[PDB]
Every structure is written in structure tokens, then in C-alpha cells.
Design a protein around this ligand. Structure first.
Ligand SMILES: O=C(CCCCC[SeH])Nc1ccccc1
Ligand SMILES: [K+]
Ligand SMILES: [K+]
Ligand SMILES: [Zn+2]
Length: 353
């Protein structure tokens, strides 16, 4: 068994020139990488090369219009970069942004290809900027192209149209773009746990509520697990995996598992307010590894506490490498309510619930 790892310093070039302390920092990926070195996890992995996604690969999920406007920013003046960035919800743009978003998608394509052709069994991708908020026609929430959605489609392009792909999004924010891209799709199962607060939490839409189960052929194939009422942690996430995520994934029988692995639900995160521990992310990784013959790709998304996200993603890689999971309580009342609301809403589609 070989675990793959992809990381390219060039993805650090994406930067906010008006606010050097914006939390989507270049140092997010370099701090994670260094800790993988310090923990001797990088030497245990097979290094997968990064590459630029092609426009034809970007068109798998994104419209020509959206690609060409993000593309045009590569040659923009700072005034135009500021104006363009302000046109979106929570976006900053620099001249290198487009390039880095291409590298983040291509790095994951290469990783999914390594998994699917048997070169590695599983893989971890330390990439930025994130993508789960990116729609087919819009950039949003620090995301430009939806790296996880593109990798699902890329994976099917190099295998077959009907490849079954499970995207688990344990980023603290709802992946609105991933849900929308696959909302009418029964070949890609989307499962998102996320702080909701009746829509008061970013991305601030009721599309994230438990009653959004998909559309058309895709009904049943979108599972939203929204949290209400303050800090959640390991017990809430483990119970959601026990009653929901893992029963549904087993009935779905994914052939490939992609993890939209934001770490902004970890303690110390200012954009999450949760307390999921590094040991908890290790158990979520371990449980997902029981699916799809272990074919798991962990794609970095959010996560803004440099220490918490380096510790957390290190724990996940260690689980992929096969290390014994570490030792790891009553749920808050609203978490019980959230879980049973998802349970009742998806009972029609998943008989094992
Ligand atoms: O939280 C965000 C964006 C964070 C997205 C997580 C990307 Se994974 N933006 C905001 C907008 C208005 C007021 C307060 C915050
Ligand atoms: K999520
Ligand atoms: K779906
Ligand atoms: Zn997030």
C-alpha cells in the first residue's frame, strides 16, 4: 500500500495584496507541508507531481464565461483586480490567482489518476486556493474553481461515465458549488457536514439545510448535515458518521472517495468556532478508508489556524499510511436534532437508515 502526496510551492503565489493578514494565507499549505516533513510523513509517501489543469478539464464543471474572466485577471492592473474581486462574495484576486487555481485542480487530477490506475492506493493533496464554494459560473468564498467537483468529473472521464464517486465535505462551511454541480446527478454522492445557524453562517443560504436531498435523478444523492447552536466537536461528528455518513456511503458503494477536507471546524479556527480535534479527523479518515477498496483522496479546502490545520491534516495522512488510529460523550441537544432531521429526510432513499 502506497500513500501519495502532492504539494507545489507555486500555489503560494496566490495572495491578497490589500490585506497581508487575510486568513486564506499562502502559509496555510507551507505550514502543513513542513509539519508533514517534521513528522517524517512526507518520506513515507510517494510524491505525486503537480500540473496545471487545462481549460477543457475546467469546462467539465465550469462555463466558458466563468473560466475566461478568472483567466483574464492574470494580466489585470491592481485597480481592476480589486474591482473584480469585490464583484464576488468573499474573493480576493492577484495576477497569479488563476495559475494557482489551475495547479490546485491539476494536482488533484494527477492524484485521482494515481489512485485509479493503481500507482497509489490513497492520496493527500495540500492545495490552495480552495474550491467547494465555486459554482459552475461563479467564484465565491476564497474559491475559484471547484477542485473536488472537477476531480470527480475528471475521474469519470478517465474511467467511465458511471463511476460512483462519494464527495464527503467536512469543511465547516457548506459546499454550495459542489451540491449545485451534482444536484441532479445520481453518479456522484455529496455529503456535507457544516455549521448552518438557520442560514446565518456563510455561505448564508438555506440550500444547506437537511431538506435539500437533490433534484430529479439525483434525489437522495445529496445529504446535508447542518449544525445549529454553537460549538460542535468530535462527538457530534463521530455520531453523524455513525448514523448517517457511513450507512449511506456503504449503501451507495462508492468506487472512489474524495474528501473536501477543510479544517476550519478544528479548535482555534476563527471562521468555524468548533472544536474538532486532530484525533477526530484521524477517525473520520479511518472510517472513510473502509470504503471503495481504500480509494480515498483528501483535498485541502478551508482551515485558517495554521497550527490546527497542520496538526489535523498530518493526522489524516498518518491514517492513510495505515497507522493505528489514536484514542478519541453526550451530543449537544441540537446535534441530536440535526442528525434525526437528516435521518427522517433521507429514510425514503436509504433503506439501511
Ligand atoms: O466568512 C466568510 C468567508 C469564509 C469562507 C470559508 C471558505 Se472554505 N465571509 C464573510 C462575509 C461577510 C461577513 C463575514 C464573513
Ligand atoms: K461541509
Ligand atoms: K448528487
Ligand atoms: Zn470553510
Amino acid at each position: 500500500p502506497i500513500t501519495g502526496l502532492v504539494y507545489d510551492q507555486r500555489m503560494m503565489l496566490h495572495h491578497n495584496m490589500w490585506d497581508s493578514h487575510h486568513p486564506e494565507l499562502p502559509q496555510r499549505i507551507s505550514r502543513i507541508f513542513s509539519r508533514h516533513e517534521e513528522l517524517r510523513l512526507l518520506s513515507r509517501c510517494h510524491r505525486i507531481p503537480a500540473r496545471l489543469a487545462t481549460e477543457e478539464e475546467l469546462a467539465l464543471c465550469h462555463s466558458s464565461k466563468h473560466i475566461s474572466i478568472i483567466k483574464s485577471s492574470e494580466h489585470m492592473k491592481p485597480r481592476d483586480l480589486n474591482r473584480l474581486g469585490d464583484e464576488y462574495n468573499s474573493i480576493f484576486i492577484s495576477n497569479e490567482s488563476y495559475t494557482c487555481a489551475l495547479l490546485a485542480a491539476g494536482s488533484c487530477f494527477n492524484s485521482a489518476q494515481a489512485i485509479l490506475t493503481g500507482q497509489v492506493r490513497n492520496a493527500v493533496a495540500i492545495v490552495r486556493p480552495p474550491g467547494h464554494h465555486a459554482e459552475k459560473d461563479t467564484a465565491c468564498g476564497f474559491c475559484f474553481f471547484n477542485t473536488a467537483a472537477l476531480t470527480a468529473r475528471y475521474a469519470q472521464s478517465i474511467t467511465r461515465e458511471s463511476l460512483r464517486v462519494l464527495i464527503v465535505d467536512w469543511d465547516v462551511h457548506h459546499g454550495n458549488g459542489t451540491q449545485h454541480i451534482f444536484e441532479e446527478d445520481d453518479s456522484v454522492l455529496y455529503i456535507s457536514l457544516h455549521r448552518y445557524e438557520d442560514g446565518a453562517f456563510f455561505p448564508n443560504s438555506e440550500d444547506a439545510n437537511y431538506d435539500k436531498v437533490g433534484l430529479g435523478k439525483g434525489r437522495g444523492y445529496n445529504v446535508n448535515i447542518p449544525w445549529n447552536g454553537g460549538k460542535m466537536g468530535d462527538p457530534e461528528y463521530m455520531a453523524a458518521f455513525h448514523h448517517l455518513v457511513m450507512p449511506i456511503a456503504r449503501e451507495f458503494a462508492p468506487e472512489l472517495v474524495l474528501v473536501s477536507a477543510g479544517f476550519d471546524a478544528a479548535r482555534g479556527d476563527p471562521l468555524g468556532g468548533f472544536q474538532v480535534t486532530p484525533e477526530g479527523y484521524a477517525h473520520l479518515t479511518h472510517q472513510l478508508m473502509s470504503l471503495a477498496a481504500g480509494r480515498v483522496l483528501i483535498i485541502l479546502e478551508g482551515g485558517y489556524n495554521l497550527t490546527s490545520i497542520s496538526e489535523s491534516m498530518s493526522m489524516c495522512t498518518s491514517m492513510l499510511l495505515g497507522d493505528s488510529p489514536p484514542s478519541l460523550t453526550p451530543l449537544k441537544t441540537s446535534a441530536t436534532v440535526s442528525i434525526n432531521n437528516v435521518l427522517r429526510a433521507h429514510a425514503p432513499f436509504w433503506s439501511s437508515l
